Amino acid sequence: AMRQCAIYGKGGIGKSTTTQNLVAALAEMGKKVMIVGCDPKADSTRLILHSKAQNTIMEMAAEAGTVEDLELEDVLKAGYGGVKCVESGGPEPGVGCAGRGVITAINFLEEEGAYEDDLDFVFYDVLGDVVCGGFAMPIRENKAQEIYIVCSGEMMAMYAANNISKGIVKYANSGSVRLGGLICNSRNTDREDELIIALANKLGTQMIHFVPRDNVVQRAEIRRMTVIEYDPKAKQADEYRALARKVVDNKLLVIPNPITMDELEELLMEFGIMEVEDESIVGKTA
Amino acid sequence: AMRQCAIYGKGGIGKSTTTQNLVAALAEMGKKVMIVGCDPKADSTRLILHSKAQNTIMEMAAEAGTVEDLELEDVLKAGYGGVKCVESGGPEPGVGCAGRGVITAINFLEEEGAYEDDLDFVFYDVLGDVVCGGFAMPIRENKAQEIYIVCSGEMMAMYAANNISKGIVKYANSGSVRLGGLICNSRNTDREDELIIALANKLGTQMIHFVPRDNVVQRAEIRRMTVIEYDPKAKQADEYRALARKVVDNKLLVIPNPITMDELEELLMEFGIMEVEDESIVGKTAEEV
Numbered sequence: 001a002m003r004q005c006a007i008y009g010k011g012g013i014g015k016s017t018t019t020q021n022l023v024a025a026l027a028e029m030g031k032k033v034m035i036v037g038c039d040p041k042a043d044s045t046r047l048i049l050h051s052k053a054q055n056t057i058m059e060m061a062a063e064a065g066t067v068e069d070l071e072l073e074d075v076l077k078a079g080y081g082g083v084k085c086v087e088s089g090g091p092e093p094g095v096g097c098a099g100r101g102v103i104t105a106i107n108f109l110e111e112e113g114a115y116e117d118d119l120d121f122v123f124y125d126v127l128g129d130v131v132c133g134g135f136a137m138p139i140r141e142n143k144a145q146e147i148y149i150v151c152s153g154e155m156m157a158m159y160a161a162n163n164i165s166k167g168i169v170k171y172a173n174s175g176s177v178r179l180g181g182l183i184c185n186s187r188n189t190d191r192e193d194e195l196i197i198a199l200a201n202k203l204g205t206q207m208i209h210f211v212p213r214d215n216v217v218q219r220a221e222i223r224r225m226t227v228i229e230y231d232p233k234a235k236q237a238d239e240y241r242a243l244a245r246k247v248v249d250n251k252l253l254v255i256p257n258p259i260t261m262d263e264l265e266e267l268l269m270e271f272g273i274m275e276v277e278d279e280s281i282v283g284k285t286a
Numbered sequence: 287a288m289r290q291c292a293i294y295g296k297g298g299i300g301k302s303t304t305t306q307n308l309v310a311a312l313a314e315m316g317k318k319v320m321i322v323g324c325d326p327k328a329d330s331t332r333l334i335l336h337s338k339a340q341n342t343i344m345e346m347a348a349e350a351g352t353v354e355d356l357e358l359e360d361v362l363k364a365g366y367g368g369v370k371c372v373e374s375g376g377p378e379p380g381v382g383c384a385g386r387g388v389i390t391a392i393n394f395l396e397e398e399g400a401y402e403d404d405l406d407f408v409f410y411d412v413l414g415d416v417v418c419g420g421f422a423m424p425i426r427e428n429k430a431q432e433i434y435i436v437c438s439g440e441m442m443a444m445y446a447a448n449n450i451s452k453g454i455v456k457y458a459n460s461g462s463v464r465l466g467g468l469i470c471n472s473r474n475t476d477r478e479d480e481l482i483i484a485l486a487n488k489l490g491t492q493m494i495h496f497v498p499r500d501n502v503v504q505r506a507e508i509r510r511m512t513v514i515e516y517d518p519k520a521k522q523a524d525e526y527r528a529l530a531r532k533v534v535d536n537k538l539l540v541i542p543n544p545i546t547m548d549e550l551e552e553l554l555m556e557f558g559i560m561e562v563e564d565e566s567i568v569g570k571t572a573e574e575v
């Protein structure tokens with residue numbers, strides 16, 4: 001039956017590009033898939049639909065008067081391989097809450113029968129900069145049972161993974177939301193692969209796939225498309241199919257073990273990302 | 287007469303380093319200052335205190351029962367130049383709202399008379415990666431009158447500048463809160479100064495200063511310090527004394543004119559940041575060439 005997944009991770013490490021490339025690979029294997037974009041920039045569907053910007057549920061609602069008058073056809077678009085795409089829309093600057101926006105989007109999709117239409121998979125594309133109650137809404141309301149965290153071998157992306165893990169610990173007694181694994185979006189940095197496997201081991205999960213950097217991703221991105229669609233023969237295309245294969249097959253759903261800031265520094269030093277701090281020069285004029 | 291300011295801007299562009307270097311020059315120049323860190327990392331005070339991490343109000347309250355069981359001395363620490371320091375602390379991951387925490391920290395500091403104590407400036411350091419109702423708390427509740435925006439000549443920094451400006455508009459209508467200027471944190475990107483001068487004009491504001499890239503900032507950072515403390519004769523110190531002098535003298539406080547997404551992208555393209563899109567290759571497979 002339909003699996004409900006979310007991809008969570010920091011901004012500016014290519015999470016949405018990895019999400020759309022994975023979803024493309026899943027359509028190619030013959031799964032029927034929906035992407036529900038929950039990023040405030042609303043950038044989670046452009047490579048499926050070949051568009052500059054999909055009209056969001058917030059925008060279309062606040063324009064049809066309210067969500068009550070909105071037609072599913074203005075909001076749900078089909079793109080590469082029949083993948084169905086919808087955007088939440090981010091909060092209204094200075095007043096909104098992403099928790100309220102995501103609930104509106106989901107409640108609206110249920111009501112119109114989106115979740116029932118032959119779907120194998122739904123992927124919530126969600127921001128993990130700050131893991132407040134708003135961005136955790138898909139977890140609190142038991143909508144994303146299988147979470148995959150995009151990170152990279154850098155402090156802030158790994159801190160965002162840890163905080164996402166703590167969001168999953170909080171809802172543990174409540175429902176069935178589980179961490180299914182980490183995805184490492186490569187930044188070309190030494191031992192990044194080994195850093196994310198070790199972080200996975202300490203979190204009690206797996207690194208499910210290492211996504212390499214390859215120029216073919218940007219060649220496809222400039223054309224508003226996925227690699228699967230642009231160049232089905234590319235080495236990079238086989239890397240997205242492999243990750244799709246491991247996600248379809250995946251049974252390792254856990255409640256993770258969040259680590260301390262001291263244990264995070266310890267992995268980042270051990271893997272050559274961070275240096276010994278020389279406590280001796282602290283507070284001292286030149 | 288105490289001036290209540292907020293520095294808003296996206297993460298990963300050096301915002302908190304610029305803020306602390308600005309507060310450090312103001313203290314060097316006779317001013318009594320308080321920094322209220324509002325970033326979830328709670329990174330707004332380390333270079334003032336030469337400290338690894340300042341205890342946050344959220345962490346202390348939860349361990350001490352509630353915020354009512356805290357004393358001022360455990361929360362407000364003084365560092366370089368008499369500069370008073372406080373970290374709100376960020377939301378409990380998965381449950382909390384950043385605004386709930388920032389409002390709890392601000393009521394506690396008023397209640398303990400920390401705003402009456404011979405103060406020239408309060409500076410809130412606020413993350414602008416998403417301008418929800420939470421991170422606008424200092425603006426919705428009339429605590430910050432003058433907002434300055436750190437950006438850089440990068441797409442996401444300037445998208446953040448524009449959403450922060452729309453946040454000011456929502457409250458400036460029916461409030462005294464105003465936009466005081468853009469501060470460019472250089473990334474040594476070509477024509478950055480011009481891009482931010484142009485964005486400032488389109489918004490109705492000024493580019494109050496351009497902060498260059500200088501390796502002497504990391505020399506100081508590495509020792510947990512501001513450049514004014516680490517080497518006042520440095521060229522980069524006068525940069526921070528100039529930005530300070532302009533904030534002290536500033537009388538340009540505006541309701542901004544936010545720009546559309548198209549008007550912003552045409553800026554990025556007019557100054558060589560964003561590439562012009564070739565519409566003829568959109569949707570074209572390699573097999574179609």
Ligand code: SF4
Pocket residue numbers: 096097098099132133134135382383384385418419420421
């Ligand atoms: S919960 Fe998170 S998103 Fe909602 S308002 Fe508070 S901070 Fe913003």
